[PDB]
Write an enzyme that holds these catalytic residues in place. Structure first.
Site, PDB file in Angstrom:
ATOM      1  CG  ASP B  25      49.928  36.021  31.363  1.00  0.00           C
ATOM      2  OD1 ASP B  25      49.232  36.856  30.533  1.00  0.00           O
ATOM      3  OD2 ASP B  25      50.948  36.557  31.809  1.00  0.00           O
ATOM      4  CB  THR B  26      44.528  34.715  28.340  1.00  0.00           C
ATOM      5  OG1 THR B  26      44.452  35.886  28.675  1.00  0.00           O
ATOM      6  CG2 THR B  26      43.693  33.622  28.896  1.00  0.00           C
ATOM      7  N   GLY B  27      47.393  36.399  28.023  1.00  0.00           N
ATOM      8  CA  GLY B  27      48.405  37.522  27.333  1.00  0.00           C
ATOM      9  C   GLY B  27      49.910  36.997  26.932  1.00  0.00           C
TER      10      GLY B  27
HETATM   11  O1  LIG Z   1      55.867  40.948  29.358  1.00  0.00           O
HETATM   12  C1  LIG Z   1      54.538  40.686  29.677  1.00  0.00           C
HETATM   13  C2  LIG Z   1      54.263  42.231  30.551  1.00  0.00           C
HETATM   14  O2  LIG Z   1      54.763  42.926  30.517  1.00  0.00           O
HETATM   15  N1  LIG Z   1      53.146  41.787  31.266  1.00  0.00           N
HETATM   16  C3  LIG Z   1      52.523  42.432  32.279  1.00  0.00           C
HETATM   17  C4  LIG Z   1      51.478  43.486  32.337  1.00  0.00           C
HETATM   18  C5  LIG Z   1      51.492  44.127  31.255  1.00  0.00           C
HETATM   19  C6  LIG Z   1      50.141  45.072  31.080  1.00  0.00           C
HETATM   20  C7  LIG Z   1      49.625  45.443  32.150  1.00  0.00           C
HETATM   21  C8  LIG Z   1      50.002  45.044  33.421  1.00  0.00           C
HETATM   22  O3  LIG Z   1      49.325  45.260  34.508  1.00  0.00           O
HETATM   23  C9  LIG Z   1      50.865  43.924  33.415  1.00  0.00           C
HETATM   24  C10 LIG Z   1      52.513  40.626  31.239  1.00  0.00           C
HETATM   25  C11 LIG Z   1      50.988  40.225  31.592  1.00  0.00           C
HETATM   26  N2  LIG Z   1      50.659  39.281  30.959  1.00  0.00           N
HETATM   27  C12 LIG Z   1      51.395  38.894  29.609  1.00  0.00           C
HETATM   28  C13 LIG Z   1      52.371  40.171  29.582  1.00  0.00           C
HETATM   29  N3  LIG Z   1      53.777  40.001  29.183  1.00  0.00           N
HETATM   30  C14 LIG Z   1      54.116  39.300  28.110  1.00  0.00           C
HETATM   31  C15 LIG Z   1      54.497  37.878  28.258  1.00  0.00           C
HETATM   32  C16 LIG Z   1      54.893  37.359  29.662  1.00  0.00           C
HETATM   33  C17 LIG Z   1      55.520  36.144  29.808  1.00  0.00           C
HETATM   34  C18 LIG Z   1      55.656  35.183  28.715  1.00  0.00           C
HETATM   35  C19 LIG Z   1      55.314  35.744  27.415  1.00  0.00           C
HETATM   36  O4  LIG Z   1      55.347  34.877  26.485  1.00  0.00           O
HETATM   37  C20 LIG Z   1      54.527  37.125  27.286  1.00  0.00           C
HETATM   38  C1  LIG Z   2      57.433  43.386  37.813  1.00  0.00           C
HETATM   39  C2  LIG Z   2      56.041  42.221  37.870  1.00  0.00           C
HETATM   40  O1  LIG Z   2      55.851  41.828  36.860  1.00  0.00           O
HETATM   41  C3  LIG Z   2      54.519  41.601  36.367  1.00  0.00           C
HETATM   42  O2  LIG Z   2      53.633  41.664  37.216  1.00  0.00           O
HETATM   43  C4  LIG Z   2      54.376  40.377  35.294  1.00  0.00           C
HETATM   44  C5  LIG Z   2      55.536  39.934  34.693  1.00  0.00           C
HETATM   45  C6  LIG Z   2      55.199  38.823  33.541  1.00  0.00           C
HETATM   46  C7  LIG Z   2      54.164  38.424  33.305  1.00  0.00           C
HETATM   47  C8  LIG Z   2      53.174  38.824  34.033  1.00  0.00           C
HETATM   48  N1  LIG Z   2      51.925  38.302  33.831  1.00  0.00           N
HETATM   49  C9  LIG Z   2      53.017  39.843  35.051  1.00  0.00           C
HETATM   50  C1  LIG Z   3      56.698  43.456  22.062  1.00  0.00           C
HETATM   51  C2  LIG Z   3      55.717  42.604  22.052  1.00  0.00           C
HETATM   52  O1  LIG Z   3      55.129  43.149  23.582  1.00  0.00           O
HETATM   53  C3  LIG Z   3      53.840  41.869  23.711  1.00  0.00           C
HETATM   54  O2  LIG Z   3      53.766  40.986  23.050  1.00  0.00           O
HETATM   55  C4  LIG Z   3      53.272  42.127  24.747  1.00  0.00           C
HETATM   56  C5  LIG Z   3      53.583  43.388  25.785  1.00  0.00           C
HETATM   57  C6  LIG Z   3      52.623  43.721  26.721  1.00  0.00           C
HETATM   58  C7  LIG Z   3      51.659  42.720  27.228  1.00  0.00           C
HETATM   59  C8  LIG Z   3      51.529  41.486  26.685  1.00  0.00           C
HETATM   60  N1  LIG Z   3      50.483  40.672  26.961  1.00  0.00           N
HETATM   61  C9  LIG Z   3      52.299  41.278  25.346  1.00  0.00           C
END
Ligand SMILES: O=C1C(=O)N(Cc2cccc(O)c2)[C@H]2CNC[C@@H]2N1Cc1cccc(O)c1
Ligand SMILES: CCOC(=O)c1cccc(N)c1
Ligand SMILES: CCOC(=O)c1cccc(N)c1
Ligand SMILES: [Cl-]
Ligand SMILES: [Cl-]
Ligand SMILES: [Cl-]
Lengths: 99, 99
Positions: B25-27
């Site tokens: 997960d690059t995000g």
């Molecule tokens: O919390 C989320 C989040 O909401 N999503 C889901 C998402 C967000 C936007 C669109 C979508 O289809 C799905 C995840 C996705 N990658 C990191 C997005 N994160 C951030 C995250 C997660 C785990 C560890 C971390 O340090 C940061």
């Molecule tokens: C309810 C399902 O939630 C998610 O798809 C999700 C949660 C955290 C990180 C990521 N990458 C995805």
């Molecule tokens: C409050 C800050 O939230 C975040 O860093 C975040 C939100 C959604 C997706 C991702 N990848 C990151």
């Protein structure tokens, strides 16, 4: 290009005639952008992750230019803390993970 | 390897001697794993996502294999909806985005 992951992989995108900064997010199935005007019909969707779910509007067949590469797909609009380019558009620009 | 994004980039990891599935997960800035037992003391951390925040337990210098590649670093443990390998460990295994 090759983008390292020492910091957040943020890029400039062009969408709906606007420039925005967005995160290349391989963990996201979908692309989610902060509130903005987009053309066409929409339907509501819930997307979830850490913290729970938010309600978004789903727009289809939206053109985005991502870091200079044109793609088309579904874009969700809603109260996301960060603009997210998810897999549905990352595939279209030929983005892969490599190690 | 080279991993495309047409499907979720799910890989096998090894942590605490057990194989688990996790998402590259690059995000995600950080790595977060579902409830499990890890050695040593932990520190508090909050991580933010699209829908809000969760509290997690931060463990440092944890041995973890990702796709067979050995890493040692910070692992967060808590009520994440899926096991997530974030940038802290993606950088360790030399993972980049390419297009
Ligand atoms: O919390 C989320 C989040 O909401 N999503 C889901 C998402 C967000 C936007 C669109 C979508 O289809 C799905 C995840 C996705 N990658 C990191 C997005 N994160 C951030 C995250 C997660 C785990 C560890 C971390 O340090 C940061
Ligand atoms: C309810 C399902 O939630 C998610 O798809 C999700 C949660 C955290 C990180 C990521 N990458 C995805
Ligand atoms: C409050 C800050 O939230 C975040 O860093 C975040 C939100 C959604 C997706 C991702 N990848 C990151
Ligand atoms: Cl799409
Ligand atoms: Cl391809
Ligand atoms: Cl680390």
């Amino acid at each position: 290009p090759q983008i390292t992951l020492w910091k957040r992989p943020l890029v400039t995108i062009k969408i709906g005639g606007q420039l925005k900064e967005a995160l290349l997010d391989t963990g996201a199935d979908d692309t989610v952008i902060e509130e903005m005007s987009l053309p066409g019909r929409w339907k509501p969707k819930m997307i979830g992750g850490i913290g729970g779910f938010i309600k978004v509007r789903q727009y289809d067949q939206i053109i985005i230019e991502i870091c200079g590469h044109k793609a088309i797909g579904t874009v969700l609009v809603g109260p996301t803390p960060v603009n997210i380019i998810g897999r549905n558009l990352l595939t279209q620009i030929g983005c892969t993970l490599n190690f």
